[PDB]
Amino acid sequence: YDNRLRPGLGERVTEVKTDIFVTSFGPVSDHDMEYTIDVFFRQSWKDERLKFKGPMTVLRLNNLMASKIWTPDTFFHNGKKSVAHNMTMPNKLLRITEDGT
Amino acid sequence: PSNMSLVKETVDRLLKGYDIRLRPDFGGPPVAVGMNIDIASIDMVSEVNMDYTLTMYFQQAWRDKRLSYNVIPLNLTLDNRVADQLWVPDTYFLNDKKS
Amino acid sequence: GDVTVILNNLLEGYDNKLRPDIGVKPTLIHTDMYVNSIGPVNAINMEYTIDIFFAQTWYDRRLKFNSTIKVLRLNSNMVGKIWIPDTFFRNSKKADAHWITTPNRMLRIWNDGRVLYTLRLTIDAECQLQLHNFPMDEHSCPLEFSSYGYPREEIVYQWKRSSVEVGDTRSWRLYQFSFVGLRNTTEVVKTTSGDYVVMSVYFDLSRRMGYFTIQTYIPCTLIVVLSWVSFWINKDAVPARTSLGITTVLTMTTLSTIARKSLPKVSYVTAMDLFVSVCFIFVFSALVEYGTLHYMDSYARIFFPTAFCLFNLVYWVS
Ligand SMILES: *[C@@H]1O[C@H](CO)[C@@H](O[C@@H]2O[C@H](CO)[C@@H](O[C@@H]3O[C@H](CO[C@H]4O[C@H](CO)[C@@H](O)[C@H](O[C@H]5O[C@H](CO)[C@@H](O)[C@H](O)[C@@H]5O)[C@@H]4O)[C@@H](O)[C@H](O[C@H]4O[C@H](CO)[C@@H](O)[C@H](O)[C@@H]4O[C@H]4O[C@H](CO)[C@@H](O)[C@H](O)[C@@H]4O)[C@@H]3O)[C@H](O)[C@H]2NC(C)=O)[C@H](O)[C@H]1NC(C)=O
Ligand SMILES: *[C@@H]1O[C@H](CO)[C@@H](O[C@@H]2O[C@H](CO)[C@@H](O[C@@H]3O[C@H](CO[C@H]4O[C@H](CO)[C@@H](O)[C@H](O)[C@@H]4O)[C@@H](O)[C@H](O[C@H]4O[C@H](CO)[C@@H](O)[C@H](O)[C@@H]4O)[C@@H]3O)[C@H](O)[C@H]2NC(C)=O)[C@H](O)[C@H]1NC(C)=O
Ligand SMILES: *[C@@H]1O[C@H](CO)[C@@H](O[C@@H]2O[C@H](CO)[C@@H](O[C@@H]3O[C@H](CO)[C@@H](O)[C@H](O)[C@@H]3O)[C@H](O)[C@H]2NC(C)=O)[C@H](O)[C@H]1NC(C)=O
Ligand SMILES: *[C@@H]1O[C@H](CO)[C@@H](O)[C@H](O)[C@H]1NC(C)=O
Ligand SMILES: CCCCCCCCCCCC
Ligand SMILES: CCCCCCCCCCCC
Ligand SMILES: CCCCCCCC
Ligand SMILES: CCCCCCCC
Ligand SMILES: CCCCCCCC
Ligand SMILES: CCCCCCCC
Numbered sequence: 001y002d003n004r005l006r007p008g009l010g011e012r013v014t015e016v017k018t019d020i021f022v023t024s025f026g027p028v029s030d031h032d033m034e035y036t037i038d039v040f041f042r043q044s045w046k047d048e049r050l051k052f053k054g055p056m057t058v059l060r061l062n063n064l065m066a067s068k069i070w071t072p073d074t075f076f077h078n079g080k081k082s083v084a085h086n087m088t089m090p091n092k093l094l095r096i097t098e099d100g101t
Numbered sequence: 102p103s104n105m106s107l108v109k110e111t112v113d114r115l116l117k118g119y120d121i122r123l124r125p126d127f128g129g130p131p132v133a134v135g136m137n138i139d140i141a142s143i144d145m146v147s148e149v150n151m152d153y154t155l156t157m158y159f160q161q162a163w164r165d166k167r168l169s170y171n172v173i174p175l176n177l178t179l180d181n182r183v184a185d186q187l188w189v190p191d192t193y194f195l196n197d198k199k200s
Numbered sequence: 201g202d203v204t205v206i207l208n209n210l211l212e213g214y215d216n217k218l219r220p221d222i223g224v225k226p227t228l229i230h231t232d233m234y235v236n237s238i239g240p241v242n243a244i245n246m247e248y249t250i251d252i253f254f255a256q257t258w259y260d261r262r263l264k265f266n267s268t269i270k271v272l273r274l275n276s277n278m279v280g281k282i283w284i285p286d287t288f289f290r291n292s293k294k295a296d297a298h299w300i301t302t303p304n305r306m307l308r309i310w311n312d313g314r315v316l317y318t319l320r321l322t323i324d325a326e327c328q329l330q331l332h333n334f335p336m337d338e339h340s341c342p343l344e345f346s347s348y349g350y351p352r353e354e355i356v357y358q359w360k361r362s363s364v365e366v367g368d369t370r371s372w373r374l375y376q377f378s379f380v381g382l383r384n385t386t387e388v389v390k391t392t393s394g395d396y397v398v399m400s401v402y403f404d405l406s407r408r409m410g411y412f413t414i415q416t417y418i419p420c421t422l423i424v425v426l427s428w429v430s431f432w433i434n435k436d437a438v439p440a441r442t443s444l445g446i447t448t449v450l451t452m453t454t455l456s457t458i459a460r461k462s463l464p465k466v467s468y469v470t471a472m473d474l475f476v477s478v479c480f481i482f483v484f485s486a487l488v489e490y491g492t493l494h495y496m497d498s499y500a501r502i503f504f505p506t507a508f509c510l511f512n513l514v515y516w517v518s
Contacts, residue, residue, distance in 0.1 A: 002204040004277045009203060010269075032240075033373055041301065073275045073302045075320070080251075082300035102261075104223035109215045137392060142326065144293065145245075156293075160393065173223065178349050180217045181286055 003070055007047040016072045018043040034080055043072060044101060051100040058097050063090035104173065111170050112177065121188050125165040134163040134190050152198060161190060203272065206265050210309075211281055219283055219354060220260040226356045229285055231256045231345075231399060234365040235382075236320075238403060239373045241327070241341070244464045247293050248327050248341055249373075250403075255318035256285065257360075264313040276305035284317060285355060290344040290398065291326040298322070331463065334470040335412040339377075344400040351394030359384050364401055377405035416459045416472060420479045423452055424508060427486035431500045435493055445487035452476070452483050471515075478511055 006014045019042045026036025050069060052059070076082065085091040125132045137160045144154040165188070170177075194200065220227050232255040239249030263282065265272075289295060297319055298304035304320035327341035347355040369379050383402040388395050409417075427448045430441050456476040463470065469477075482504060489500050 002201070002207075004207060004274055005201065005203055009201070070275075071302065073304075075298060075301060075304045079298070079300060081296075081322070082298075084300055102224075105218065105221070108218060108222055112215070112217060139392060141290075158391075175223055177222075178351070178354060180283070181349065183217055 001049055001069065003068065006070055007045065007049065014045060014072070016043050016045045016074075018074070041074075043074060045072065046100055048100050050096050051098070052096070053098055058095050061094045061096070063092040063094070065096075066092055066094045069094075108173060108177065111172055112179065115168050115170060116183075116186055119167055119186070121186065124188055125163065125167065132163055132165075134161055134192075136161045136192075152196075161192065163190065202267070203269065206267060206269070206272065207278070210263050210265060214262055214282070216281065216283055219285075219350065220258065220262070222354075226352070226354055227258055227285070227350075228356050228358060229256050229258045229287075230358055230360045231287075232360045232362060232365075233401065234367060236367055237372050238379060238405075239322075241339075241374065241376055241405065243329050243331065243376070244462075246327060246329050246464070247324055249322065249324050250343065251320070251322050253318055254287075254321050255316065256287065257314060257316045258285065259313045260315050261313050263309050263315060264311060265309075266311055270311060272309045274307045274309070276303035276307070278307050279303075279305050279317065282307075282315070286348045286350065287345050288348045289323055289325065290346060291342065293324045293326050295321055295323040295325075331466065331470055332468065334463065334472050335376075335407055335409045335416075336471060338380075338404070338406045340383075340402045340404050342400045342402050344398055346389070346396045346398040349393075350396075352388055352397050353394075355397070357386065357397050357399045359386065359399065374405070375408075376411075377407055380404035380406050412472070416455070416462075417475065420452075420455055420459070420476055423448060423455065424479050424482050427483045428501070428504050430486055430490060431497050431504075435490070435497060438494065441490045442487075445483075445490060449480075449483040449487055452480055456480065475515065478515075479508075482508060 008014055021040040021042065023038045023040060026038060028035040047070065139158040139160070141156040141158060144156065146153040168187070234253040234255070236251040236253060239251060241248040260283065298321075306316070306318045308314075308316040323343065325341070325343050327339060329337065329339055331337050346357065363384050364382050366379070366382060372379065381404050383404070384399070385402070386397065386399050389398045426444065430444045430448070433440055433444065435441065456473075459472060459476055463472070486500070486504065489496070
């Protein structure tokens with residue numbers, strides 16, 4: 001597996017289905033013309049390389065597998081000093097469905 | 102391209118069998134570390150916190166016979182990440198509160 | 201795949217510690233900026249915040265490949281594997297890249313050897329404001345950068361044709377100022393460690409006094425008028441005149457301090473300081489006018505409005 005090349009490179013366009021769950025709409029700072037918002041930033045995509053078949057249909061894993069595989073480099077165009085939470089462990093989840101999603 | 106290949110062998114030779122744990126001339130005479138500063142700015146003198154903030158180009162030079170080469174006649178400037186593979190003085194500022 | 205083999209070949213026997221053409225010729229780097237937003241200008245601390253997409257490109261003969269693929273478009277993963285110039289910003293009080301959701305870096309490699317490397321940066325640059333005439337001051341805030349270690353014989357910079365793609369200025373956090381225009385330079389600064397090529401971008405910022413008028417001048421103008429109505433008040437009303445006089449001058453002191461508070465601790469009188477001091481003279485003189493009056497009223501009714509409006513005439517034109 002090559003972590004550097006996106007899924008379907010040279011044959012497809014990688015379609016990333018995203019969605020947001022706002023856990024809490026933070027305060028608005030009119031002095032700084034900014035606002036804070038805490039979210040569960042969900043994004044899903046198809047990766048044929050990560051296709052398996054075994055006793056289980058979905059592998060519920062931790063952040064360690066995320067760094068080993070290609071993930072979209074999504075960034076916020078108008079973002080200003082966001083933080084990805086780290087306590088107790090990196091607040092992330094990865095789930096690989098048998099079809100590769 | 103000879104220099105690119107030749108320079109690669111030289112730098113690779115030096116860092117091979119190099120022990121970062123031992124200072125230059127370990128178990129021998131002290132290593133003379135020369136220091137040289139260039140103050141970029143003194144941001145703010147604070148009486149409330151009894152401190153000042155200073156930005157400088159802190160430079161220090163010393164000799165290391167292990168890192169001596171003579172095949173190429175030029176001074177090699179390398180990536181800053183090489184500093185993590187070389188012994189450097191453990192200089193600290195006894196006054197600094199946050200640097 | 202056929203792209204993973206290419207990347208393996210490029211990094212095979214690739215020395216990340218050596219610049220392109222080391223000991224052969226200087227490495228020419230073409231820089232380019234897209235100013236996403238010039239953030240708040242911090243006149244008190246003499247700094248400003250700028251968010252940019254700092255793009256710099258160079259040739260690296262080691263990273264040349266021939267195939268049907270014209271460019272290898274990559275994420276931040278490969279940035280640490282290849283040689284990247286050690287560009288730093290000379291006047292940055294504090295800067296940081298962006299890391300949410302992942303490192304905001306991009307990397308593209310062509311067949312011939314071109315490398316395009318861009319990253320998003322928030323730079324808290326240092327702009328040395330000279331507020332001798334405030335709040336009418338105009339500044340030319342720079343942004344210098346160069347290689348920290350590589351001298352002029354090893355790293356040469358140069359502005360691309362598209363110097364600076366300044367973005368839509370409407371959404372900028374620049375409230376005090378207006379972005380007049382930009383100007384670039386390229387010069388060699390000599391230092392103790394060698395001669396380094398420096399490239400600086402000058403942003404011209406022109407102050408707006410609309411806030412300070414309502415914030416500072418208009419309260420300062422209106423309070424001065426409160427002194428003048430002392431004259432129309434009867435002289436026999438000793439507590440009334442002093443009440444107006446002492447109340448008028450004393451609140452002038454508070455206005456000067458709070459107005460002076462907006463400025464930093466600089467040891468020179470500024471134009472805002474000049475206005476409040478002159479307003480201080482009028483209120484003080486108005487109180488002193490009654491002091492001599494009890495111990496003339498009509499003349500003060502004419503001279504005081506004329507002197508202030510005339511004084512404003514001299515001040516504002518300047
Ligand atoms: C004294 O102690 C302090 C700790 O108190 C040390 O500071 C720490 O140093 C380490 C190592 O340099 C830093 O780790 C690196 O962090 C990178 C991103 O950090 C961002 O998030 C952290 C929070 O997690 C913030 O603190 C950072 O901001 C602070 O630091 C920056 C400078 O880094 C300042 O500018 C800021 O003002 C803050 O002060 C950042 O916002 C992280 O990317 C990096 O990991 C990459 O690099 C390593 C290098 O081997 C790789 O192993 C790793 O896999 C990553 O590489 C991937 O990403 C790069 C990105 O381009 C690609 O190029 C690669 O190819 C690959 O894809 C590393 O983890 C740490 O952040 C920092 N601060 C802490 C811990 O608070 C001092 O260094 C230490 N020494 C001295 C002299 O002071
Ligand atoms: C790799 O890096 C080294 C060091 O940075 C370079 O060597 C320097 O080369 C320059 C170019 O000639 C030298 O410049 C002059 O050298 C004179 C010789 O002095 C020698 O004698 C004593 C030793 O006891 C020391 O002064 C010195 O370290 C030398 O060993 C100096 O006397 C000169 O001093 C003054 O010159 C003028 C006077 O107006 C001033 O402008 C200078 O700033 C200085 O005050 C001058 O320094 C330099 O001395 C060399 N230094 C060393 C340590 O060798 C290599 O050239 C470089 N290699 C490259 C680029 O390929
Ligand atoms: C940012 O810096 C760049 C680099 O100096 C500026 O662009 C460069 O401008 C010079 C001067 O105009 C160009 O040279 C001139 O070209 C014209 C047109 O061919 C020619 O008639 C002149 O005799 C002279 O040769 C230079 O080509 C150009 N850079 C490139 C890559 O072409 C740019 O103007 C600066 N941005 C500003 C000032 O806002
Ligand atoms: C790469 O291939 C092209 C044609 O396929 C050839 O012209 C070129 O010389 C080659 N470059 C090399 C081998 O460096
Ligand atoms: C709070 C300000 C008090 C008045 C200051 C008097 C000193 C002279 C200021 C004008 C000098 C050009
Ligand atoms: C009594 C005077 C109040 C208004 C002064 C305005 C002066 C504008 C100057 C414009 C530049 C010539
Ligand atoms: C000496 C300070 C001014 C006091 C008022 C004097 C009126 C003649
Ligand atoms: C009797 C004259 C009073 C002052 C005239 C108005 C000046 C503002
Ligand atoms: C301050 C202007 C109004 C008063 C003018 C008429 C006074 C007799
Ligand atoms: C621009 C604010 C000052 C206007 C002139 C006021 C003079 C009485």
